[PDB]
Subunit: 79 residues, 7 copies
């Protein structure tokens, strides 16, 4: 079957991803929805700071605007 | 399962709207457009943690173009 | 529903406009537009947080793409 | 509608504020749907005053960078 | 009357001034423009507060119209004062 | 003759991506498309001149509209 | 005489300067171009303000036309002041 960047976004549904917006902020959540424009819907969204033991704020269920995203960590693994 | 009807399901509830400014706002969502244009009843700007209320704007119309994200169920307390 | 119809209901009233640079402007709304191009009267710039006019501009055509939000029902005084 | 309010001020002085917050005045000649303007005798005046900074002559201002345009400057004369 | 792009198109073979989004100004001799306000200038040099300096020569440059604040189409008349 | 068809010659290779943040990231390019969206494996953030990584993000989807330039083969050897 | 984007294609194999919106300048030898001003460069070297002194080597880069301020076509001869 096919493989394209945007399909790989659609395959990350129901798993834990990191989204980095353009302001430099990073939010971890359980990916639930996507679209072509990269509009995300996440569950248990938590802002984090790199370094640090992850969370610094919780936002619950969040609709993210694809226009403002820099990248998406498709399968975020803490090791 | 569209990312947008999740938004329009959140109408009549209290939402958090963050903008590129890092500016966060909280208010009862009334109306919603496909380009994520927003109207909020009782929209008070809140700093992050802080104190919360910073400025009370009443009913605001928010351009969708300038939004980072929207916490659709921001009765997260 | 439709968020921009909420803009045609503020005409001939005072509104507050937050622009992208963060500067705020009060004035009386006259005409509107699809691109949220606004025309205000007695428009005075006020500084972030306060109600103090630091500059008055009179009748002002505002470009819509540079607007953060519009406080539609700025009675709240 | 707004963009015909703009044409009211043809051959009259308007004030234009760009995204970087720099303000410019000059006599409006020509406009279009994206608010691309043409001004004569363009100057930088400094905010609050009408004391020039830089003269620029006839200028074409790209519309997307415009914060606002005060079409009825020159009545701020009063 | 009117069509802002036209005043740009009659400015060919003239000395113009371009203020870009980075906030810097340049002068040069205009040579090619299009509908997207893309500019081709000769003898381009960065520009200042008053008269006009030669801070940095960039020669023959193509200027992407999407990042231009404005263009002064008769700048020679200006620095002829 | 096409700038983008030089990008797809870099798949499975290590490239450097500088976002508009100025922030730069190295990683094995896996997937691309016409919008210059990229998928990197072992995406790590770097500071030019230094050896230590700023952050590890693993397999990353990079949105194409926020990229400055792609070093479509970082031969640092 | 002709059309801006096309004058960019007469600059293939030349040393050109590219300034991005952030303000950083890069020097390299132009390979491939398209309508949206997307570029491919060899010898891509970031140079410091106005000078011709290298600060970072990037080799072959695909540059996004969206983020360009300008392109100094044939930049080679424009190295009078130094080298």
């Amino acid at each position: 079957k096919v493989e394209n960047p945007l399909k790989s976004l659609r395959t990350a549904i129901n798993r834990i991803v990191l989204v980095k917006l353009k302001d430099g902020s990073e939010y971890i959540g359980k990916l639930e929805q996507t679209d072509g424009t990269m509009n995300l819907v996440l569950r248990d969204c938590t802002e984090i700071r790199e370094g640090t033991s992850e969370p610094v704020a919780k936002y619950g269920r969040v609709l993210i605007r694809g226009s403002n995203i820099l990248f998406i960590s498709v399968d975020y693994e803490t090791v």
